[PDB]
Design an enzyme around this catalytic site. Structure first.
Site, PDB file in Angstrom:
ATOM      1  CE  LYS A  11      38.666 -83.548  34.536  1.00 16.28           C
ATOM      2  NZ  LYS A  11      39.013 -84.895  35.076  1.00 16.28           N
ATOM      3  CB  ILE A  37      30.776 -77.610  10.860  1.00 14.22           C
ATOM      4  CG1 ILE A  37      30.802 -76.975   9.471  1.00 14.22           C
ATOM      5  CG2 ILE A  37      32.008 -78.523  11.038  1.00 14.22           C
ATOM      6  CD1 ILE A  37      32.050 -76.091   9.229  1.00 14.22           C
ATOM      7  CB  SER A  40      16.402 -68.148  26.176  1.00 16.71           C
ATOM      8  OG  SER A  40      16.636 -67.543  24.897  1.00 16.71           O
ATOM      9  N   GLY A  95      19.976 -66.439  22.330  1.00 18.16           N
ATOM     10  CA  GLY A  95      20.810 -66.896  21.232  1.00 18.16           C
ATOM     11  C   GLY A  95      20.116 -66.918  19.885  1.00 18.16           C
TER      12      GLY A  95
HETATM   13  N1  LIG Z   1      18.864 -81.061  22.397  1.00 16.04           N
HETATM   14  C1  LIG Z   1      17.755 -80.183  22.665  1.00 16.04           C
HETATM   15  C2  LIG Z   1      17.893 -78.809  22.162  1.00 16.04           C
HETATM   16  C3  LIG Z   1      16.976 -77.878  22.337  1.00 16.04           C
HETATM   17  N2  LIG Z   1      15.793 -78.237  22.923  1.00 16.04           N
HETATM   18  C4  LIG Z   1      15.043 -77.291  23.163  1.00 16.04           C
HETATM   19  C5  LIG Z   1      14.784 -76.511  24.656  1.00 16.04           C
HETATM   20  C6  LIG Z   1      14.519 -75.069  24.240  1.00 16.04           C
HETATM   21  O1  LIG Z   1      14.158 -74.049  25.184  1.00 16.04           O
HETATM   22  C7  LIG Z   1      14.552 -74.990  22.899  1.00 16.04           C
HETATM   23  C8  LIG Z   1      14.537 -73.918  21.995  1.00 16.04           C
HETATM   24  O2  LIG Z   1      15.862 -74.265  21.513  1.00 16.04           O
HETATM   25  P1  LIG Z   1      17.279 -73.425  21.640  1.00 16.04           P
HETATM   26  O3  LIG Z   1      18.446 -74.188  21.189  1.00 16.04           O
HETATM   27  O4  LIG Z   1      17.151 -72.269  20.735  1.00 16.04           O
HETATM   28  O5  LIG Z   1      17.712 -73.005  23.184  1.00 16.04           O
HETATM   29  P2  LIG Z   1      17.142 -71.786  24.132  1.00 16.04           P
HETATM   30  O6  LIG Z   1      16.058 -71.003  23.514  1.00 16.04           O
HETATM   31  O7  LIG Z   1      16.618 -72.395  25.382  1.00 16.04           O
HETATM   32  O8  LIG Z   1      18.382 -70.805  24.549  1.00 16.04           O
HETATM   33  P3  LIG Z   1      19.145 -69.809  23.473  1.00 16.04           P
HETATM   34  O9  LIG Z   1      18.563 -69.964  22.106  1.00 16.04           O
HETATM   35  O10 LIG Z   1      19.010 -68.408  23.997  1.00 16.04           O
HETATM   36  O11 LIG Z   1      20.583 -70.228  23.349  1.00 16.04           O
HETATM   37  O12 LIG Z   1      14.971 -76.349  22.206  1.00 16.04           O
HETATM   38  C9  LIG Z   1      15.438 -79.587  23.655  1.00 16.04           C
HETATM   39  O13 LIG Z   1      14.454 -80.020  24.270  1.00 16.04           O
HETATM   40  N3  LIG Z   1      16.591 -80.588  23.377  1.00 16.04           N
HETATM   41 MG   LIG Z   2      16.472 -70.324  21.439  1.00 16.52          MG
HETATM   42 NA    NA Z   3      28.319 -76.511  14.477  1.00 15.42          NA
END
Ligand SMILES: Nc1ccn([C@H]2C[C@H](O)[C@@H](COP(=O)(O)OP(=O)(O)OP(=O)(O)O)O2)c(=O)n1
Ligand SMILES: [Mg+2]
Ligand code: NA
Ligand SMILES: [Cl-]
Ligand SMILES: [Cl-]
Ligand SMILES: [Cl-]
Ligand SMILES: [Mg+2]
Ligand code: NA
EC number: 2.7.7.7
Length: 326
Positions: free
Chosen positions: A63, A97, A171, A180
DNA sequence: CCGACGACGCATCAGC
DNA sequence: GCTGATGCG
DNA sequence: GTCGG
């Protein structure tokens, strides 16, 4: 970004497989390849060059060759044309969703934002809130606003009980210039792995943040995890700030380091690290690192006094949060 | 070839 | 009601 | 979809 065209294509493929195909292992495989290519410090010139990276195989290398030669991927050009896939992909952008509900809604002829607004009665509570703030939840949060939000949360928790400790993770803790959402790790000495000496520890914090009109909505709420919505106050005649997602996790205070490692992520970083732990004979969750016995059953929790202790158990050099954005 | 792919909290539902 | 499976995050 | 054994 050096290989942004390639990593965007792989992300769109990942989302297709998760949302439409409901193929979660293909979703994770495309995400892993996009992550390893994103940190590769050369502009990729061939699919063969990319296949050298772990997680890029024969199909993705093919790809990448197509993309490099043409700037496009026929497979994706088709998916973008396809009404059912396009409708499902869109509906999953609403919080609450997922792939299953998105296909059910599309089956019942609910396929646009207008359709959702008209059929609010068919949404559960979470989906209803995700629709209400659909626009706001797509906006990033500038770090300057994250700092204002941190100052509110930490001061309001202090007002409830000065022994709470709130740490902004995600993050934000990795140093991102925008986020986010906001993720907050909460501890209190009355809640440990050994006992819970006070009820309502998360509840009291949620209530206080609601009283000062910081938290505006709840998506889900239990004894240890809150998922909801918040908003910064604005000044006189100022436009309001966007509503923002906030997650709060109350962790046993003696398990803070496993908790802050987990809640700092990234999610791909945790997946890579936990997979490596398994290869090394341990299992890591947000509470403990445990050894795996001869049969593969987890043993008793190992002592942990720092994030680095967890890296040491699995024989990884320490990586600062800013170097965990995989 | 083929099994494994990180680990878990809360909401919702089926079955009893 | 409780338990277990599924969805979603 | 990719990879280790
Ligand atoms: N399936 C997942 C989803 C998230 N987390 C974790 C890693 C993180 O750093 C965190 C905090 O969750 P977020 O979804 O809010 O992701 P981030 O903070 O890292 O990035 P952003 O919120 O800016 O998109 O949850 C994990 O271990 N497994
Ligand atoms: Mg986050
Ligand atoms: Na969704
Ligand atoms: Cl799959
Ligand atoms: Cl394309
Ligand atoms: Cl545990
Ligand atoms: Mg979050
Ligand atoms: Na490879």
């Amino acid at each position: 970004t050096l290989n942004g065209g390639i990593t965007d294509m792989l992300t769109e493929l990942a989302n297709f497989e998760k949302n439409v195909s409901q193929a979660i292992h293909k979703y994770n495989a495309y995400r892993k390849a996009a992550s390893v290519i994103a940190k590769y410090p050369h502009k990729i010139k061939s699919g063969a060059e990319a296949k050298k990276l772990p997680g890029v195989g024969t199909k993705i290398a093919e790809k990448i060759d197509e993309f490099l030669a043409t700037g496009k991927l026929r497979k994706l050009e088709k998916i973008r044309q396809d009404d059912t896939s396009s409708s499902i992909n869109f509906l999953t952008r609403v919080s609450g969703i997922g792939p299953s509900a998105a296909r059910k809604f599309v089956d019942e002829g609910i396929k646009t934002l207008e359709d959702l607004r008209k059929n609010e009665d068919k949404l559960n509570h979470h989906q209803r809130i995700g629709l209400k703030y659909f626009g706001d939840f797509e906006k990033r949060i500038p770090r300057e606003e994250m700092l204002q939000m941190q100052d509110i949360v930490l001061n309001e928790v202090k007002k409830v009980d000065s022994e709470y400790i709130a740490t902004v993770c995600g993050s934000f803790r990795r140093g991102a210039e925008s986020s986010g959402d906001m993720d907050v790790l909460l501890t209190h000495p009355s809640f440990t792995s050994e006992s819970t000496k006070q009820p309502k520890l998360l509840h009291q914090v949620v209530e206080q943040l609601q009283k000062v009109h910081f938290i505006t909505d709840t998506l889900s709420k239990g004894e240890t995890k809150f998922m909801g919505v918040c908003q910064l106050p604005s000044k006189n005649d100022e436009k309001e700030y966007p509503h923002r997602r906030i997650d709060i996790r109350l962790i046993p205070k003696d398990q803070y380091y496993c908790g802050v490692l987990y809640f700092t992520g990234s999610d791909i970083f945790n997946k890579n690290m936990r997979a490596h732990a398994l290869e090394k004979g341990f299992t890591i969750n947000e509470y403990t690192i445990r050894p795996l016995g001869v049969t593969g059953v987890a043993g008793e929790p190992l002592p942990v006094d720092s994030e680095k202790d967890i890296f040491d158990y699995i024989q990884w050099k320490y990586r600062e949060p800013k170097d965990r954005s995989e």
